[PDB]
Amino acid sequence: RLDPEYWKTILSCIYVFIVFGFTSFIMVIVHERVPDMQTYPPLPDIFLDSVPRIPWAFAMTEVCGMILCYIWLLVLLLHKHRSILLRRLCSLMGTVFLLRCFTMFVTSLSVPGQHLQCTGKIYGSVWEKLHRAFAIWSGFGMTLTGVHTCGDYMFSGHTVVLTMLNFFVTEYTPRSWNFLHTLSWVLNLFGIFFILAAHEHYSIDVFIAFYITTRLFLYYHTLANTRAYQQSRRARIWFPMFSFFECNVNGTVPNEYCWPFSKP
Amino acid sequence: RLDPEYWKTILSCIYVFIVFGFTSFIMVIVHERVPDMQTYPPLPDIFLDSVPRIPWAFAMTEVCGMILCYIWLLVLLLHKHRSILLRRLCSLMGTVFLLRCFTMFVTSLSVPGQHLQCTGKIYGSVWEKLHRAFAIWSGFGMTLTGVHTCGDYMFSGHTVVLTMLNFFVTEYTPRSWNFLHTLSWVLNLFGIFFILAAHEHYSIDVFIAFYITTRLFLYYHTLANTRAYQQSRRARIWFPMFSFFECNVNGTVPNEYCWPFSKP
Amino acid sequence: RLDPEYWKTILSCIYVFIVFGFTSFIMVIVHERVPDMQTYPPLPDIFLDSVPRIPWAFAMTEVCGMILCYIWLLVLLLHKHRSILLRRLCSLMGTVFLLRCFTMFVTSLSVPGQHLQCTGKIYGSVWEKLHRAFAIWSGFGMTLTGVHTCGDYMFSGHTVVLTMLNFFVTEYTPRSWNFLHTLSWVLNLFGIFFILAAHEHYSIDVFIAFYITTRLFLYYHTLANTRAYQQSRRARIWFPMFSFFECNVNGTVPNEYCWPFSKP
Amino acid sequence: RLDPEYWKTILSCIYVFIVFGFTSFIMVIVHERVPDMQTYPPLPDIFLDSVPRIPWAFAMTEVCGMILCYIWLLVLLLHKHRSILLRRLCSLMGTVFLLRCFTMFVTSLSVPGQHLQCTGKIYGSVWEKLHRAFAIWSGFGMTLTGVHTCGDYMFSGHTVVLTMLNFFVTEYTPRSWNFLHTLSWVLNLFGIFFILAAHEHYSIDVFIAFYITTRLFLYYHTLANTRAYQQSRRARIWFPMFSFFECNVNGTVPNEYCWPFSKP
Amino acid sequence: RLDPEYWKTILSCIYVFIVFGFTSFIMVIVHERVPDMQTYPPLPDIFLDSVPRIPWAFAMTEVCGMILCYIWLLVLLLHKHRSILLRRLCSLMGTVFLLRCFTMFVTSLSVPGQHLQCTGKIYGSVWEKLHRAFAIWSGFGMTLTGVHTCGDYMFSGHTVVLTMLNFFVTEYTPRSWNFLHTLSWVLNLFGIFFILAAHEHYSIDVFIAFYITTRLFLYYHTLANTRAYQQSRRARIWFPMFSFFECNVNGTVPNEYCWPFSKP
Amino acid sequence: RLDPEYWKTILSCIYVFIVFGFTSFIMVIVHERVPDMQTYPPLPDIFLDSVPRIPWAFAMTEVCGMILCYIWLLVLLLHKHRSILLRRLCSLMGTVFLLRCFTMFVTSLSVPGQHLQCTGKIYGSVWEKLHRAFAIWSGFGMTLTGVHTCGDYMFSGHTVVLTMLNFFVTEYTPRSWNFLHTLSWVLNLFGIFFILAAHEHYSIDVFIAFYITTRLFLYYHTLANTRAYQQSRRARIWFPMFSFFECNVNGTVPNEYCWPFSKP
């Protein structure tokens, strides 16, 4: 049966936190390989040339981000297998960000001209790069709490987070609320449009990020539902910490709702 | 029963030819939207900074290409169901090059510095666009027969052709010949390595090309083997003309080989 | 029945210590047979001539060795039949190092020009050669604790140790952990590549060392699994102290894990 | 049933001739990588330093080789299944000489000072390098007809040929003639000893050549006797052109003698 | 049944002691027939002309004899039927040294020039010949405890002792320790080579000594195992006191080993 | 059955003739290794120091050899299986003389003082030692037909021939003529006495020759009678051409006598 394991969720949380820290450190390291990165003219793209620069394009995208988390944690509160939900979400997020780190290290591609005014630069020594990494870690990347002061690289994390939250929200509700699913979909597409129209990422970057998160999420859910982690030695699943997480769960997780407060 | 439909192979070949012409025409549109494409500084990668440029590394990849195509024709000659193989191959290449057209249209990504001496430019009119289109089409894009005079763009097709031919060669030979398979894999790896070391394309270009070819090839083979084109309305398959092309053949194609010449 | 005998492991450890001391003394003696060994021009190799010397490339090999040793210690801690594993590892390493001594005494093949600054030399007598042997013995031969001051000779031991530890880690873990196996393989390959690129040994030395360790390991384990130590007079096994160590063990050793500590 | 295939032996002979030509060309090109190779002090060996040079010690090896060749020809003449023997000998020697090419291209190990009077050198171009290759090929490499004028490199071929012919003579005679076997063993040992005492190869070269020939011969014959070419996909035998040559032969080859001449 | 007779071993040991005394007597008497025996030129051999004399090659033989003797008493201690072994060994040595006495008495063959500085000579009388005889007897004939001051004679006894101890070690230690047998054979071969190369004995003397020891040992073992002392009057065996010695023992001696100490 | 083979005795004759020629050539070449050989004083032996040299001591021994072969051919003429005797006699004489050649090559031991007047010496060339070999071959070594002009070496052939003839004569007659056996025995001992008193050989040489011929003859006859040449792989008889000669003969050879003349 489905036994709720309370000592594995914290392991997933620390794992995803270490993944975020490694991503921030790799970002800091890679931001050094090019000193200026703000003098070249932009590469010819289809979308960013038609629409002129709209200064406030970031605000609503990220605010839609917290709307998505808000609905996500409300669905979390009243659903009985919350532990499995928090066990799957971090386990997927860490792997996606590890792929982002690998793509980051292989190739760097930014937007040539945005945040040409961020100051600092050339921190050559061991002591203070850790300070930048800790800042962008405990700043969580929003532009409201100013950490994202200069440019951004290939494989934007905003798109991945938005799509992952939308999919997790839409998949763990009963299949009769087809109005919240539509709202989440239009909300995610609005966020995608706005970040693309912010002139900070190229169309190919957002497209491959969206495709990668969708494919990884669907593949993980199909593998979990099929229950092939122990059926046979089918394909030697390469997902980081997959069998150690879903071995205690057999079959598909139901969608029963309850209330963990004994004070009606 | 396997009925060789000889009136559908011509349609597939015509479709592939118009696809190639369309690809040439789209490239014709693409390489005029920014004038210079040669004054920019190269983007920082890991494999374009360590290994210096080699000026004979761009023809060994193609030599491997002709080797692989000759091997594929040799395999095609001695096969009972030649029409089905020639049908599937063209159907795959059409979709792959449509994807190439799309990804080149959305964004243009080049190598800033190679083939800077190529002449022409400022070709603004309607009449002679078809001229370079026909030249690139009936020059087949090799660097030996000089057509590839200026630089190349996103989603290189050389790796696409090499990977498709390699996988087709390894697929339709009896499963005891994995010494030719080793040779084909070595040829594909050498072609990829020389493409990368010729300073013709970025690393992510080659990686996404290889991954998309492998994924499309394996997915199409699984779909064809599972005879899901008419079993049920599973996903409304998105392949250009798939049900039209594979409806007359049921089950998995065997590995019976014969000799079409009746003169021993 | 598997009987863990604690009075044979001490014998195996003593045997390995004696073999290591003999190897150190033989190396000390061999270092005298050539006066300079540091003025000749290096022989033309295909790896030593393409990649210039990397000054820091030798410590990474010992780092990989330390990581593999830590993993092997962890495996030995959590195994039911630890004594048999410890008896087998020593019984293999002793034979391999005896072969190293023989092939070092047959011919001396050094690298002419590395560690050319090392002092000492011409310590001709019986009284202080043993001092150098004792230093090399109780310095463990690593360059971190500086004992390896002059060059090294044929049949390098670093590759032997790395390959033996990697094979023992790979084989004595459950056959479902196929990411630890890949990590160990990557570590071993990187160690071999670094020892080759540090201008420390010729390519043939590393290749023959790897082949000899692999063949000896596979042959010994096949003989142990086939119980050919008592089945018949097949070949009069030439492994030093083989039948004595495996007479009490029948069949193959299972993979049961436990915790020797009785305080949960 | 043993079917003597008369159309495969020609293929084996052609394969051996091609391999020999390739080996000669690779030796010719390898000889250029070091300018002098005749001024360095020799490496300290234990056999090259005890026994001074004997000027006439090299022709005895070729005399023993000719005696063994005559005995093997006599055995081949009076055997029922001559074709299989001729098809096996070539298929083994080709692989061994390919291994020789690989291990002598990887590293070069010559004797610095013997045949120091040989003239020629620096024939740099493509037109007359093939002339040197042709001379070495159609001189058979024997010193009686002077072609082997300068030094030789690692993995000597004289020991390979002697050991292969000795093993073929020993194994393919009735198991009651144990004085011919002793004579062949004595001839092979004397040939190896004269090779070592003629100051032509280091001890490790001869030892590894002998071991490699013995191991390859025993492995090939064990695989042929156990009939593993069609039993299952055990290990995918790496012998070049192995399954093709032994497909029609089942079991083991008997030892019935006859006389092909029909005029008693 | 094997009944250990402890009243017959003493007789055999006493007989051996009188045999040794008579051997010293015969050597002393024979030494007086030729006054000088040191001015002759050496007889031409094949092995006394190539290798020059080595001054330390005479003590290594006795070191090998001592270690073989120690191994022999180690085997003697742990044997159930120790008395039978001690009876047979002494019975063999008595006959061998009687034949040695005979072959010195008929003819004298010496090495002309070694130990030419030994003093004494011309000791013609009865009284003090007993003194030198007793010195040779209770000096046991080693060169370390200096008794062997002058030259030696035909049919060297060093090879006799080495071969007898070697064959006794290999026969009466169970038939599967086929590593100790190799060590004993190597020791015997090294002893023979050193006594030959020490310019102490002619080659024919060593060869006939080895042959006679091997023949007598094997013949006695076959005679004892076949139990021909009472089967019939076959040939009236000529061995000194053979039927009186092995009358009790019936059949082949088994190889049961025990521990005579009752204090674990 | 016992079939007379007439095409094998000629092989025996040619084999023994080649052995005789090889012995003569070896004697000729070995005679060169000492120039003078006639200045040393005789070694101390018991028998040649007592009785003075008899100048006419050689003749009667050799004419008694003539008597021996006379009675041998008389027995040959009137016995039915003469072919088997002519096969065995030469097959044994060849092996004995090969042993004589080996022992002559290893060590040379002569009589220093007899035949001081033979002239010639120092034939340093290639041409004329063959003349001496041919002379001593087609002079058959008698002292009557003067060829044997100087001294002889160890392993005298006269003793071997006399003993072999005596044994062959005494074994192939019915066991009821115990007066001719006594005549042959006293005749043989007379020949031995006379040749050893001719101051022509040492006692040890004659004793060794007699023992070797007796042992070889008895061993060959026991092997032939036991019929172990095909019973099993007992000891792999080392006799030169043993199984080839005695495979057509089964059991013991009888002693039926007849007359091959049809003219009574």
Ligand SMILES: CCCCCCCCCCCC/C=C\[C@@H](O)[C@H](CO)NC(=O)CCCCCCCCCCC
């Ligand atoms: C429930 C999941 C919460 C995840 C929140 C993401 C925080 C990542 C910060 C780690 C530092 C790495 C630096 C940069 C990258 O992360 C990229 C680069 O722009 N920035 C980002 O992705 C920032 C994503 C902002 C939109 C998230 C909306 C969901 C809000 C949940 C808040 C509790």
Ligand SMILES: CCCCCCCCCCCC/C=C\[C@@H](O)[C@H](CO)NC(=O)CCCCCCCCCCC
């Ligand atoms: C059998 C199929 C052959 C197709 C080969 C290329 C045809 C593409 C024509 C369409 C117009 C676009 C032109 C060029 C682009 O495609 C890209 C841009 O760099 N260049 C290319 O692809 C050129 C790839 C050459 C390597 C192929 C080696 C295999 C040899 C087989 C020859 C029969």
Ligand SMILES: CCCCCCCCCCCC/C=C\[C@@H](O)[C@H](CO)NC(=O)CCCCCCCCCCC
């Ligand atoms: C777990 C097994 C530990 C074995 C360590 C052996 C230490 C030296 C003993 C042999 C004496 C002869 C001296 C030197 C030669 O052996 C060669 C010369 O290059 N140096 C060596 O091999 C030294 C091996 C270095 C790599 C080991 C990495 C694994 C780390 C485990 C250590 C706890």
Ligand SMILES: CCCCCCCCCCCC/C=C\[C@@H](O)[C@H](CO)NC(=O)CCCCCCCCCCC
């Ligand atoms: C029956 C087998 C015949 C094989 C003869 C091979 C002749 C050379 C062909 C290979 C081309 C490369 C050239 C040289 C190298 O190979 C090495 C260099 O040291 N020379 C060799 O190996 C030549 C081996 C000589 C000893 C053979 C004795 C057996 C007598 C048969 C003679 C016809």
Ligand SMILES: CCCCCCCCCCCC/C=C\[C@@H](O)[C@H](CO)NC(=O)CCCCCCCCCCC
């Ligand atoms: C266990 C029995 C050991 C006996 C060995 C010889 C004892 C003396 C024999 C009788 C007196 C004649 C004296 C000498 C002659 O025999 C010859 C002439 O050179 N010298 C010898 O033999 C001396 C042979 C020494 C080497 C043997 C090594 C074994 C060590 C065992 C010691 C307990």
Ligand SMILES: CCCCCCCCCCCC/C=C\[C@@H](O)[C@H](CO)NC(=O)CCCCCCCCCCC
């Ligand atoms: C039927 C057997 C015939 C044997 C005849 C042997 C003649 C040559 C022997 C071998 C060639 C080497 C030459 C000489 C040495 O051997 C020694 C030198 O001292 N001379 C010998 O031994 C010759 C021994 C003569 C005494 C025997 C007499 C009977 C002869 C019968 C012949 C019809």
